[PDB]
Structure 1
């Protein structure tokens, strides 16, 4: 089989959430995850006279710790009936060699599952900032609930007497409403990312556009982060001191697509809300022998025999996407 060092991927394709909210990463050296091992936040100074030594500061963080991550693991065959994509300006002379073809196929595969893996921690963050509840289920999985510690005002839906859909589309000003939503944000609101169908309702108000600064160039760094995701994310403009993003990326189930966000929903938060990227041990006998129990991803290649007589490529990880302050975002289910 192939050596473990064959990990030539070097691609950063985090779908709009791992690349903006969960910059920090904390792998774990133990199977389960203990939340109480995060570094945490620090107090003021403990002002003291310069004659006596003071007390030592210790940061612990949170109370509940005993969580357990999901353990997805994609596995794939490399049956050399694979019709290789014709790389431009590649000589067909190398196409004769079975070894080059096999290496090409396994490298294509590695990309295949690396696109297959990103989605799970993607909707992990989606569920994180949608309600702050996280249920993980599945066959042969022992479903687990995760409570992030959210309040109920972070999930207010516009469902009263007056809604954005059943009022004036010309004279109403959505601002007063957006600050009414963002007042209980535990911080400055900075991202008002939209679901496109919901944005269709939002933009219907003209009062948006006479104040919508949709100048090219969000802030000169947001586009430096979002152009790579040219298929799923789009940037509208400035609503003054804040940015507007429309995201319609889709996760595909066994046979059909599905959008990550609920249709008529929007969320409020900030670009600097720190989010944890905790991972778990890789319970591979080989991994313990190579001291890589603490990592994010793990490739493997091996040749089985007898019943499934083939050779396979293997990935496994433990994503338990977390956010430091669940209440830093408020979710409005539009109506």
Structure 2
């Protein structure tokens, strides 16, 4: 019994770092133990009327505040030994075949790709968790937990309640434009883009007033797509809505064997497409790395041989990433339940 391998597919998930790309640019590597982020109140009281006689009540000069932060550390590793090189590969045809040493440069490439993908997933999760809520915590099983906490006002992170929830109230005679205005009133600075979890988008477009705002001759200038546009891709740049741009993001990250969605089940996030975001990378800590001169860099790779009884030639990536938001209360997060 012989055989031929005609084709051999690959299975992946819809992964796309939209939140990292849009809102987090201009990375800053830093060779420093801890960084600073400062905010100045900028709040001036109106001048109370003063008689031309009393002439007093000096007003304090405004002063800001600072926050201290530290970056985490991440290092996934892989391995390869001669015991598993001999047998075969699941993507190699029984005919022809390859050498017992060429199969050693396929497992290595697969390993390195998996390491890079894991690092990217970590970076995306850190990026997203800061946008939805002001602070995110960094922890593991061997890593002592540290929490990064940007100062975000309590007025933001608006969560709907027993009153004012879109699901309960009827889809006829109700307009959500009123709400998207009141919610956006809390933002500091102009908003220019909205991010929808797919169920949130499905719930939003069901309103009959929204469908009226499309086919009005002069009532607006918005153009959308209430039909189906993207069915497999992770991001779907739909049309504008008056002035703002509407985006539906549905990304996948895997913790344990299962797949999970990034945006948690129909949230809606306001924000500005030019929002000031920082991408800081800490200092890598390998005494063989600090030899070259490489420090405060991203994705330092290395490998070595253990000279053990069954051999083994490992492979490794390490990043030490940190995500920061210079202006935390510029976004507005909505539970939309």
Corresponding residue of 2:305: 303
Task: Name the CA distance, whole Å, in 1 between partners of 2:163 and 2:263.
Answer: 25
Kindly name which structure, 1 or 2, has the bigger radius of gyration based on alpha carbons.
2
With over 3 angstroms needed to count, the CA separation of the structure-2 counterparts of 1:323 and 1:3, relative to structure 1, is farther
Task: Name the CA distance, whole Å, in 1 between partners of 2:22 and 2:309.
Answer: 45
With over 3 angstroms needed to count, the CA separation of the structure-2 counterparts of 1:288 and 1:35, relative to structure 1, is farther
With over 3 angstroms needed to count, the CA separation of the structure-2 counterparts of 1:207 and 1:218, relative to structure 1, is closer
With over 3 angstroms needed to count, the CA separation of the structure-2 counterparts of 1:95 and 1:2, relative to structure 1, is closer
1:174-217 Cα shifts (integer Å, max 9, x gaps) = 11110111112112211211111222211111222333599999
1:275-331 Cα shifts (integer Å, max 9, x gaps) = 110011111112110111121111111112337841111011111101111111011
Task: Name the CA distance, whole Å, in 1 between partners of 2:313 and 2:84.
Answer: 14
Unaligned segments of structure 1, at least 5 residues: none
Corresponding residue of 1:145: 147
Q: Which moved further from structure 2: 4-13 or 177-186? A: 4-13
Corresponding residue of 2:98: 96
SS of the residue 1:193 aligns to: strand
Q: Is the 8 A contact 1:301 1:313 kept in 2?
A: yes
With over 3 angstroms needed to count, the CA separation of the structure-2 counterparts of 1:3 and 1:171, relative to structure 1, is closer
Q: Is the 8 A contact 1:218 1:237 kept in 2?
A: no
Task: Name the CA distance, whole Å, in 2 between partners of 1:33 and 1:124.
Answer: 17
| Deviation, structure 1 residue 236 | 2.7
SS of the residue 1:244 aligns to: strand
Q: Is the 8 A contact 1:133 1:147 kept in 2?
A: yes
User: Would you say 1:328 and 2:327 are equivalent positions?
Assistant: no
Corresponding residue of 1:259: 261
Task: Name the CA distance, whole Å, in 2 between partners of 1:80 and 1:26.
Answer: 41
With over 3 angstroms needed to count, the CA separation of the structure-2 counterparts of 1:175 and 1:298, relative to structure 1, is same
1:69-113 Cα shifts (integer Å, max 9, x gaps) = 121111011346779999999999996344443333322322211
**What TM-score do you get using the length of structure 2 for normalisation?**
0.76
Unaligned segments of structure 2, at least 5 residues: none
With over 3 angstroms needed to count, the CA separation of the structure-2 counterparts of 1:56 and 1:20, relative to structure 1, is farther
Q: Which moved further from structure 2: 168-177 or 90-99? A: 90-99
SS of the residue 2:121 aligns to: helix
Task: Name the CA distance, whole Å, in 2 between partners of 1:307 and 1:48.
Answer: 89
Give the total of aligned pairs. 335
Q: Which moved further from structure 2: 67-76 or 208-217? A: 208-217
With over 3 angstroms needed to count, the CA separation of the structure-2 counterparts of 1:84 and 1:305, relative to structure 1, is closer
